[PDB]
mmCIF file of C-alpha atoms in Angstrom:
data_model
loop_
_atom_site.group_PDB
_atom_site.id
_atom_site.type_symbol
_atom_site.label_atom_id
_atom_site.label_comp_id
_atom_site.label_asym_id
_atom_site.label_seq_id
_atom_site.Cartn_x
_atom_site.Cartn_y
_atom_site.Cartn_z
ATOM 1 C CA UNK A 2 0.728 14.186 5.087
ATOM 2 C CA UNK A 3 1.452 10.496 5.598
ATOM 3 C CA UNK A 4 0.728 8.481 2.443
ATOM 4 C CA UNK A 5 -1.224 5.298 2.595
ATOM 5 C CA UNK A 6 -1.449 3.310 -0.701
ATOM 6 C CA UNK A 7 -4.983 0.531 -3.732
ATOM 7 C CA UNK A 8 -7.974 -1.786 -3.918
ATOM 8 C CA UNK A 9 -10.395 -2.654 -6.701
ATOM 9 C CA UNK B 1 7.320 -16.034 8.122
ATOM 10 C CA UNK B 2 7.578 -15.548 4.359
ATOM 11 C CA UNK B 3 4.464 -14.090 2.771
ATOM 12 C CA UNK B 4 4.108 -14.568 -0.998
ATOM 13 C CA UNK B 5 2.495 -11.742 -2.911
ATOM 14 C CA UNK B 6 -0.525 -12.442 -5.057
ATOM 15 C CA UNK B 7 -2.928 -9.915 -6.599
ATOM 16 C CA UNK B 8 -5.895 -12.218 -5.746
ATOM 17 C CA UNK B 9 -5.030 -12.688 -2.054
ATOM 18 C CA UNK B 10 -4.220 -9.732 0.185
ATOM 19 C CA UNK B 11 -1.273 -10.228 2.492
ATOM 20 C CA UNK B 12 -3.073 -10.111 5.844
ATOM 21 C CA UNK B 13 -2.151 -11.164 9.377
ATOM 22 C CA UNK B 14 -3.893 -11.422 12.714
ATOM 23 C CA UNK B 15 -2.712 -8.824 15.247
ATOM 24 C CA UNK B 16 -3.627 -7.981 18.816
ATOM 25 C CA UNK B 17 -3.952 -4.203 19.130
ATOM 26 C CA UNK B 18 -3.967 -2.319 22.426
ATOM 27 C CA UNK B 19 -5.081 1.287 21.997
ATOM 28 C CA UNK B 20 -4.718 1.812 25.786
ATOM 29 C CA UNK B 21 -8.350 3.032 25.817
ATOM 30 C CA UNK B 22 -10.027 -0.380 26.126
ATOM 31 C CA UNK B 23 -8.955 -4.020 26.339
ATOM 32 C CA UNK B 24 -6.643 -5.361 23.587
ATOM 33 C CA UNK B 25 -8.522 -6.695 20.553
ATOM 34 C CA UNK B 26 -7.753 -8.966 17.609
ATOM 35 C CA UNK B 27 -7.831 -7.506 14.102
ATOM 36 C CA UNK B 28 -6.959 -8.743 10.655
ATOM 37 C CA UNK B 29 -4.513 -6.274 9.178
ATOM 38 C CA UNK B 30 -3.140 -5.704 5.672
ATOM 39 C CA UNK B 31 0.638 -5.786 5.420
ATOM 40 C CA UNK B 32 1.345 -2.647 3.373
ATOM 41 C CA UNK B 33 4.800 -1.490 2.324
ATOM 42 C CA UNK B 34 3.068 1.481 0.683
ATOM 43 C CA UNK B 35 1.738 2.818 4.001
ATOM 44 C CA UNK B 36 3.979 5.364 5.758
ATOM 45 C CA UNK B 37 2.013 4.798 8.982
ATOM 46 C CA UNK B 38 -0.198 2.058 10.494
ATOM 47 C CA UNK B 39 -4.040 2.476 10.337
ATOM 48 C CA UNK B 40 -6.404 0.888 12.860
ATOM 49 C CA UNK B 41 -10.208 1.013 12.949
ATOM 50 C CA UNK B 42 -11.873 3.633 15.119
ATOM 51 C CA UNK B 43 -14.151 0.794 16.343
ATOM 52 C CA UNK B 44 -11.293 -0.242 18.659
ATOM 53 C CA UNK B 45 -11.489 2.965 20.715
ATOM 54 C CA UNK B 46 -13.696 3.939 23.648
ATOM 55 C CA UNK B 47 -16.363 6.607 23.037
ATOM 56 C CA UNK B 48 -14.461 9.576 24.473
ATOM 57 C CA UNK B 49 -10.895 9.143 23.238
ATOM 58 C CA UNK B 50 -9.239 12.408 22.288
ATOM 59 C CA UNK B 51 -8.043 11.870 18.698
ATOM 60 C CA UNK B 52 -6.374 14.581 16.609
ATOM 61 C CA UNK B 53 -7.422 15.692 13.124
ATOM 62 C CA UNK B 54 -4.991 14.907 10.327
ATOM 63 C CA UNK B 55 -4.639 14.725 6.545
ATOM 64 C CA UNK B 56 -3.710 11.588 4.672
ATOM 65 C CA UNK B 57 -2.704 11.223 1.034
ATOM 66 C CA UNK B 58 -4.096 8.164 -0.746
ATOM 67 C CA UNK B 59 -5.082 6.967 -4.215
ATOM 68 C CA UNK B 60 -7.767 9.607 -4.879
ATOM 69 C CA UNK B 61 -5.899 12.545 -3.325
ATOM 70 C CA UNK B 62 -5.746 14.130 0.124
ATOM 71 C CA UNK B 63 -8.417 13.297 2.708
ATOM 72 C CA UNK B 64 -9.128 15.343 5.828
ATOM 73 C CA UNK B 65 -12.204 13.409 6.949
ATOM 74 C CA UNK B 66 -11.272 9.758 6.969
ATOM 75 C CA UNK B 67 -8.397 9.555 9.483
ATOM 76 C CA UNK B 68 -7.502 10.791 12.934
ATOM 77 C CA UNK B 69 -4.237 10.457 14.870
ATOM 78 C CA UNK B 70 -4.041 8.718 18.272
ATOM 79 C CA UNK B 71 -2.855 10.767 21.256
ATOM 80 C CA UNK B 72 -1.415 7.744 23.067
ATOM 81 C CA UNK B 73 0.903 5.090 21.692
ATOM 82 C CA UNK B 74 -0.669 1.911 20.268
ATOM 83 C CA UNK B 75 0.867 -1.485 21.102
ATOM 84 C CA UNK B 76 0.587 -4.291 18.548
ATOM 85 C CA UNK B 77 1.438 -7.991 19.086
ATOM 86 C CA UNK B 78 1.798 -10.306 16.093
ATOM 87 C CA UNK B 79 0.910 -13.992 16.285
ATOM 88 C CA UNK B 80 3.969 -15.725 17.680
ATOM 89 C CA UNK B 81 5.713 -12.874 19.562
ATOM 90 C CA UNK B 82 5.272 -11.601 23.145
ATOM 91 C CA UNK B 83 7.281 -8.469 22.393
ATOM 92 C CA UNK B 84 4.947 -5.685 21.234
ATOM 93 C CA UNK B 85 5.485 -3.185 18.463
ATOM 94 C CA UNK B 86 4.920 0.216 20.059
ATOM 95 C CA UNK B 87 3.926 3.056 17.739
ATOM 96 C CA UNK B 88 4.074 6.552 19.184
ATOM 97 C CA UNK B 89 1.052 7.495 17.165
ATOM 98 C CA UNK B 90 -0.975 5.888 14.452
ATOM 99 C CA UNK B 91 -3.770 6.683 12.053
ATOM 100 C CA UNK B 92 -7.318 5.767 13.001
ATOM 101 C CA UNK B 93 -9.813 5.057 10.195
ATOM 102 C CA UNK B 94 -13.085 6.810 11.126
ATOM 103 C CA UNK B 95 -14.949 4.736 8.519
ATOM 104 C CA UNK B 96 -13.681 1.358 9.888
ATOM 105 C CA UNK B 97 -12.705 0.114 6.453
ATOM 106 C CA UNK B 98 -9.012 -0.295 7.128
ATOM 107 C CA UNK B 99 -6.583 -2.089 9.402
ATOM 108 C CA UNK B 100 -3.109 -1.723 7.868
ATOM 109 C CA UNK B 101 0.308 -2.534 9.337
ATOM 110 C CA UNK B 102 2.600 0.030 7.644
ATOM 111 C CA UNK B 103 6.369 0.607 7.527
ATOM 112 C CA UNK B 104 6.456 2.127 11.022
ATOM 113 C CA UNK B 105 5.421 -1.258 12.464
ATOM 114 C CA UNK B 106 7.283 -3.355 9.861
ATOM 115 C CA UNK B 107 10.471 -1.489 10.767
ATOM 116 C CA UNK B 108 10.081 -2.516 14.371
ATOM 117 C CA UNK B 109 9.713 -6.189 13.553
ATOM 118 C CA UNK B 110 12.537 -6.030 11.013
ATOM 119 C CA UNK B 111 10.187 -6.847 8.133
ATOM 120 C CA UNK B 112 11.699 -6.647 4.651
ATOM 121 C CA UNK B 113 10.573 -6.859 1.048
ATOM 122 C CA UNK B 114 12.599 -9.381 -0.970
ATOM 123 C CA UNK B 115 12.721 -9.406 -4.747
ATOM 124 C CA UNK B 116 14.865 -12.276 -6.146
ATOM 125 C CA UNK C 1 17.782 -7.638 -3.205
ATOM 126 C CA UNK C 2 16.479 -7.282 0.347
ATOM 127 C CA UNK C 3 14.594 -4.014 0.787
ATOM 128 C CA UNK C 4 14.462 -2.774 4.415
ATOM 129 C CA UNK C 5 11.255 -1.086 5.481
ATOM 130 C CA UNK C 6 11.425 2.312 7.112
ATOM 131 C CA UNK C 7 8.509 4.740 7.633
ATOM 132 C CA UNK C 8 10.834 7.670 6.693
ATOM 133 C CA UNK C 9 12.020 6.193 3.386
ATOM 134 C CA UNK C 10 9.516 4.981 0.780
ATOM 135 C CA UNK C 11 10.583 1.679 -0.836
ATOM 136 C CA UNK C 12 11.006 2.637 -4.475
ATOM 137 C CA UNK C 13 12.410 1.066 -7.605
ATOM 138 C CA UNK C 14 13.346 2.276 -11.093
ATOM 139 C CA UNK C 15 11.120 0.514 -13.630
ATOM 140 C CA UNK C 16 10.850 0.672 -17.457
ATOM 141 C CA UNK C 17 7.174 0.836 -18.386
ATOM 142 C CA UNK C 18 5.914 0.053 -21.930
ATOM 143 C CA UNK C 19 2.240 1.124 -22.304
ATOM 144 C CA UNK C 20 2.293 -0.081 -25.941
ATOM 145 C CA UNK C 21 0.730 3.319 -26.830
ATOM 146 C CA UNK C 22 4.000 5.269 -26.730
ATOM 147 C CA UNK C 23 7.801 4.995 -26.315
ATOM 148 C CA UNK C 24 8.742 3.112 -23.094
ATOM 149 C CA UNK C 25 9.973 5.248 -20.230
ATOM 150 C CA UNK C 26 11.845 4.494 -17.039
ATOM 151 C CA UNK C 27 10.124 5.813 -13.901
ATOM 152 C CA UNK C 28 10.543 5.631 -10.159
ATOM 153 C CA UNK C 29 7.799 3.452 -8.718
ATOM 154 C CA UNK C 30 6.584 2.658 -5.190
ATOM 155 C CA UNK C 31 6.813 -0.994 -4.113
ATOM 156 C CA UNK C 32 3.399 -1.525 -2.637
ATOM 157 C CA UNK C 33 2.219 -4.794 -1.086
ATOM 158 C CA UNK C 34 -1.063 -3.075 -0.291
ATOM 159 C CA UNK C 35 -1.824 -2.451 -3.971
ATOM 160 C CA UNK C 36 -4.141 -4.997 -5.699
ATOM 161 C CA UNK C 37 -2.841 -3.791 -9.042
ATOM 162 C CA UNK C 38 -0.130 -1.614 -10.534
ATOM 163 C CA UNK C 39 -0.712 2.105 -11.278
ATOM 164 C CA UNK C 40 0.864 4.051 -14.200
ATOM 165 C CA UNK C 41 0.741 7.848 -14.771
ATOM 166 C CA UNK C 42 -1.578 8.891 -17.650
ATOM 167 C CA UNK C 43 1.305 10.980 -18.941
ATOM 168 C CA UNK C 44 2.972 7.753 -20.151
ATOM 169 C CA UNK C 45 0.125 7.131 -22.671
ATOM 170 C CA UNK C 46 -0.488 8.838 -26.028
ATOM 171 C CA UNK C 47 -3.119 11.586 -26.130
ATOM 172 C CA UNK C 48 -6.497 10.045 -26.966
ATOM 173 C CA UNK C 49 -5.740 6.371 -26.351
ATOM 174 C CA UNK C 50 -8.913 4.449 -25.483
ATOM 175 C CA UNK C 51 -9.024 3.992 -21.714
ATOM 176 C CA UNK C 52 -11.759 2.327 -19.694
ATOM 177 C CA UNK C 53 -13.724 3.748 -16.803
ATOM 178 C CA UNK C 54 -12.986 2.099 -13.486
ATOM 179 C CA UNK C 55 -13.507 2.535 -9.755
ATOM 180 C CA UNK C 56 -10.709 2.385 -7.233
ATOM 181 C CA UNK C 57 -10.834 2.225 -3.448
ATOM 182 C CA UNK C 58 -8.058 3.968 -1.495
ATOM 183 C CA UNK C 59 -7.485 5.941 1.708
ATOM 184 C CA UNK C 60 -9.994 8.701 0.906
ATOM 185 C CA UNK C 61 -12.659 6.142 -0.027
ATOM 186 C CA UNK C 62 -13.907 5.307 -3.514
ATOM 187 C CA UNK C 63 -13.124 7.310 -6.644
ATOM 188 C CA UNK C 64 -14.949 6.838 -9.973
ATOM 189 C CA UNK C 65 -13.059 9.581 -11.790
ATOM 190 C CA UNK C 66 -9.390 9.522 -10.894
ATOM 191 C CA UNK C 67 -8.301 6.228 -12.467
ATOM 192 C CA UNK C 68 -8.854 4.572 -15.824
ATOM 193 C CA UNK C 69 -8.123 0.986 -16.826
ATOM 194 C CA UNK C 70 -5.774 0.370 -19.826
ATOM 195 C CA UNK C 71 -7.002 -1.225 -23.066
ATOM 196 C CA UNK C 72 -3.697 -2.982 -23.897
ATOM 197 C CA UNK C 73 -1.276 -4.958 -21.698
ATOM 198 C CA UNK C 74 1.527 -2.996 -19.988
ATOM 199 C CA UNK C 75 5.002 -4.565 -19.911
ATOM 200 C CA UNK C 76 7.362 -3.678 -17.048
ATOM 201 C CA UNK C 77 11.085 -4.393 -16.845
ATOM 202 C CA UNK C 78 13.056 -4.033 -13.618
ATOM 203 C CA UNK C 79 16.736 -3.084 -13.240
ATOM 204 C CA UNK C 80 19.018 -5.756 -14.749
ATOM 205 C CA UNK C 81 16.101 -7.918 -15.939
ATOM 206 C CA UNK C 82 15.375 -8.582 -19.613
ATOM 207 C CA UNK C 83 12.121 -10.545 -19.138
ATOM 208 C CA UNK C 84 9.124 -8.255 -18.795
ATOM 209 C CA UNK C 85 6.397 -8.431 -16.245
ATOM 210 C CA UNK C 86 3.261 -8.560 -18.358
ATOM 211 C CA UNK C 87 0.148 -7.029 -16.841
ATOM 212 C CA UNK C 88 -3.106 -7.899 -18.641
ATOM 213 C CA UNK C 89 -4.501 -4.627 -17.423
ATOM 214 C CA UNK C 90 -3.568 -1.974 -14.954
ATOM 215 C CA UNK C 91 -4.683 1.298 -13.480
ATOM 216 C CA UNK C 92 -3.933 4.671 -15.004
ATOM 217 C CA UNK C 93 -3.665 7.787 -12.820
ATOM 218 C CA UNK C 94 -5.429 10.636 -14.659
ATOM 219 C CA UNK C 95 -3.857 13.095 -12.202
ATOM 220 C CA UNK C 96 -0.237 12.043 -12.925
ATOM 221 C CA UNK C 97 0.433 11.590 -9.206
ATOM 222 C CA UNK C 98 1.237 7.878 -8.823
ATOM 223 C CA UNK C 99 3.540 5.156 -10.114
ATOM 224 C CA UNK C 100 2.941 2.073 -8.010
ATOM 225 C CA UNK C 101 4.217 -1.452 -8.363
ATOM 226 C CA UNK C 102 1.393 -3.643 -6.995
ATOM 227 C CA UNK C 103 0.995 -7.345 -6.139
ATOM 228 C CA UNK C 104 0.113 -8.257 -9.725
ATOM 229 C CA UNK C 105 3.631 -7.218 -10.727
ATOM 230 C CA UNK C 106 5.280 -8.434 -7.509
ATOM 231 C CA UNK C 107 3.844 -11.900 -8.008
ATOM 232 C CA UNK C 108 5.591 -12.118 -11.400
ATOM 233 C CA UNK C 109 8.888 -10.953 -9.760
ATOM 234 C CA UNK C 110 8.412 -13.645 -7.158
ATOM 235 C CA UNK C 111 8.814 -10.896 -4.542
ATOM 236 C CA UNK C 112 7.804 -11.786 -0.971
ATOM 237 C CA UNK C 113 7.476 -10.128 2.396
ATOM 238 C CA UNK C 114 9.591 -11.502 5.204
ATOM 239 C CA UNK C 115 8.791 -10.958 8.884
ATOM 240 C CA UNK C 116 11.505 -12.587 11.008
#
């Protein structure tokens, strides 16, 4: 799979 | 331009996105060196676009539900450039939470990370 | 160092991470402008360190379970740099999947994005 990255 | 990186302020830019299914629209997109592929909101697309199912790996593991793949290329123009980025396919967020310019697009506009 | 962006090659760095709960270890970490804060594998912390509940939003939506927040600061040293990045707090991957250098760390490096 493509990776896509992070929010709080 | 040079975009400083700051935990409190996401590195975002205005982009004009043409999905080739409706007129080009302006979005605010996150510049993300941790995205393999660009993500645009499904809200951009006309009601009966054929989009493919796909899996995407993110923070909490693999998702099958959240993203589709476009069937047609997407063209993207950044503020002060007439020359579009053309992505053969890109991810489409079915929840409309995310517009993300990833390394596919950044490659085309010769974007780099620089650490002194 | 200029780091070219390429969808086929993830932009990674070797970083020495000091959780202050265990011996420091050097890991390969993703350079991630789309990360609000840095993520460290739970395997770098001692068994039974106090770790705080936290929520994280990523590609598959929100997870309550997957990440903890550290109790102590985490120091991070890059190749050929003596001075540590000092992160007041950062995320901890309870699934041992992710090591991610986020904008909190990149700000202290004075890293930037450059789009010509």
